[PDB]
Ligand binder design. Structure first.
Ligand SMILES: N#Cc1ccc([C@H]2[C@@H](O)CCCc3cncn32)c(-c2ccccc2Cl)c1
Ligand SMILES: [Zn+2]
Length: 221
C-alpha cells in the first residue's frame, strides 16, 4: 500500500539531497578558498607550495595545444585552486590586438561553467611549451613568473615539452634577492648546448613542484 509512490519519493529525496550536498560543498570550498586568498600565506613563505596536482582533462588540452604549434612555442592559461601547499589544476584554455579582454572574458565563462556543475575554480597559473629543449624556465620566463608571483599571486608556471615520456614541469620563482639553501638537480634533463647557459644561470632563481595527476568524476567523459 503506497509501495510504488514510496519508491518515487525515495528516488526524489535521493536526487534532491545530492543537489543540496553539491551546493553545500561548493559553498564550503568557496569560503575556504576566500579564507586563504585573503590570508595570503605564500607572501611570507618562499617554499610554501610544494605539490602540483593536474587533472587528466587539463593535461589532454595542454598537450594537444603544445603539439599543434609543432616546432613553435605555445602558451595558455590554467584554471584551478589552492589546497594547502598544493596547486590544483583542473582545466586550461589556449591563448589567445586592442587589449587581452578576451583572455579575461574567457576566464569568467570557464569559472561560471564550472560553478554550474558545483566546481570551484579560478585562474591558478599559465602554461607554455619548449618544443624539444625540456622543462625549465628561461631568463625571460623567470622575470615573467617573478612578476606573476607579485601581481597574479597565487600563480604557477607549467612548462610542457611535447616532442620528447611525460615531460611536464611545474615551477615557482623565488623573490628577487632570495638566496635559498641545499641542492636541487633532482631528475637529470638533456637540454641543447645553445640553451645550457640560459638554463644553468637562472636554474637557482626558482624551484620545481612535485607533479601528480588525477582523473575527476566529471573528467571521465
Ligand atoms: N608572459 C610571457 C611569455 C614570456 C616568454 C615567452 C617566450 C619568449 O621568451 C620567446 C622564446 C620562446 C619561449 C620559451 N619560453 C618562453 N618563451 C612567451 C611566449 C610568447 C609567444 C608564444 C609562446 C610563448 Cl611561451 C610568453
Ligand atoms: Zn619558456
Amino acid at each position: 500500500s503506497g509501495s510504488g509512490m514510496a519508491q518515487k519519493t525515495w528516488e526524489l529525496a535521493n536526487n534532491m539531497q545530492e543537489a543540496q550536498s553539491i551546493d553545500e560543498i561548493y559553498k564550503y570550498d568557496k569560503k575556504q578558498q576566500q579564507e586563504i586568498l585573503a590570508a595570503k600565506p605564500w607572501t611570507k613563505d618562499h617554499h610554501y607550495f610544494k605539490y602540483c596536482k593536474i587533472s587528466a582533462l587539463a593535461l589532454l588540452k595542454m598537450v594537444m595545444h603544445a603539439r599543434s604549434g609543432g616546432n613553435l612555442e605555445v602558451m595558455g592559461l590554467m584554471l584551478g585552486k589552492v589546497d594547502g601547499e598544493t596547486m590544483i589544476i583542473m582545466d586550461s584554455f589556449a591563448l589567445p590586438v586592442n587589449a587581452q579582454a578576451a583572455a579575461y572574458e574567457y576566464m569568467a565563462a570557464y569559472i561560471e561553467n564550472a560553478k554550474q556543475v558545483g566546481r570551484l575554480e579560478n585562474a591558478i597559473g599559465w602554461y607554455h611549451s619548449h618544443p624539444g629543449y625540456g622543462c625549465w624556465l628561461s631568463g625571460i620566463d623567470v622575470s615573467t613568473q617573478m612578476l606573476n608571483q607579485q601581481f597574479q599571486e597565487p600563480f604557477v608556471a607549467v612548462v610542457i615539452d611535447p616532442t620528447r615520456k611525460v615531460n611536464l614541469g611545474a615551477f615557482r620563482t623565488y623573490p628577487k634577492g632570495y638566496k635559498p639553501p641545499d641542492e636541487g638537480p633532482s631528475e637529470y634533463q638533456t637540454i641543447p648546448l645553445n640553451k645550457i647557459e640560459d638554463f644553468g644561470v637562472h636554474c637557482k632563481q626558482y624551484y620545481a613542484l612535485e607533479v601528480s595527476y588525477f582523473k575527476s568524476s566529471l573528467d571521465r567523459k
